[PDB]
Write a protein that binds this ligand. Structure first.
Ligand SMILES: C[C@]1(CNC(=O)COc2ccc(Cl)cc2)NC(=O)NC1=O
Ligand SMILES: [Ca+2]
Ligand SMILES: [Ca+2]
Ligand SMILES: [Ca+2]
Ligand SMILES: [Zn+2]
Length: 209
């Protein structure tokens, strides 16, 4: 049994748009993401548990990289040193209505650092809330936090075989409901946990939302 104690943050733009329904919306999005992380195709399921919810702070702008870095610096200040403190969280995810962009286009919907889930200085993800598929983007970004690569990467070719229908496709496409995670994704999270990088995921949270 593994539990990810999750801080969910929504910016002022999320509050402006969603209003009174924002909390319920965020919990609905996170419930759908949590469902993906329990699917047997992941090989080593984890329970994504919302433990803290902040409605706004960090500097949010078009640059996905800058927004991720600002958010990740800011979230550190909310955390506590020890995982046994009930206020401690294992990962931080920001939802924003800001159109996040890369170097040349604004097609990106989110960003996360890779393989950082039990590093409180780096366990961070951002998601552009599209209003419908935000749970899939959240799952993709959290996949990265769990050390997953894209399914068209060189290592995934040999793990997935010759025969873009998974969460870790590089761009959103229709996800296979019987296999949201590719064999590559399953292998990478499994290795990550087997190698001890999920050492902060063993304590069970007292007060889930
Ligand atoms: C740059 C970019 C662009 N991709 C996205 O923003 C979102 O990608 C997906 C979302 C949902 C699903 Cl199901 C599949 C893919 N950011 C990122 O984290 N990896 C990337 O290559
Ligand atoms: Ca804890
Ligand atoms: Ca965008
Ligand atoms: Ca923990
Ligand atoms: Zn990605």
């Amino acid at each position: 049994s593994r539990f990810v104690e999750t801080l969910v943050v929504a910016d002022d733009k999320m509050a402006a748009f969603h209003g009174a329904g924002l909390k319920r919306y965020l919990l609905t999005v996170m419930a759908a993401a949590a469902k993906a992380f329990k699917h047997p195709s992941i090989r080593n399921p984890v329970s994504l548990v919302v433990t803290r919810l902040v409605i706004l702070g960090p500097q949010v702008g078009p640059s996905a990289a800058q927004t991720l870095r600002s958010f990740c610096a800011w979230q550190r200040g909310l955390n506590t040193p020890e995982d046994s403190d009930p206020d401690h969280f294992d990962t931080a995810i920001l939802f924003t209505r800001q159109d996040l962009c890369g170097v040349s286009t604004c097609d990106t919907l989110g960003m996360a650092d890779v393989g950082t889930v039990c590093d409180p200085a780096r366990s961070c993800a951002i998601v552009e809330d599209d209003g419908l598929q935000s749970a899939f983007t959240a799952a993709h970004e959290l996949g990265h936090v769990f050390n997953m690569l894209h399914d068209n990467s060189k290592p995934c070719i040999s793990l997935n075989g010759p025969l873009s229908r998974h969460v870790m496709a590089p761009v959103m496409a229709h996800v296979d409901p019987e296999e949201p995670w590719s064999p590559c994704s399953a292998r990478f999270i499994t290795d990550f946990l087997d190698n001890g990088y999920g050492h902060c995921l063993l304590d069970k949270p007292e007060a889930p939302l």
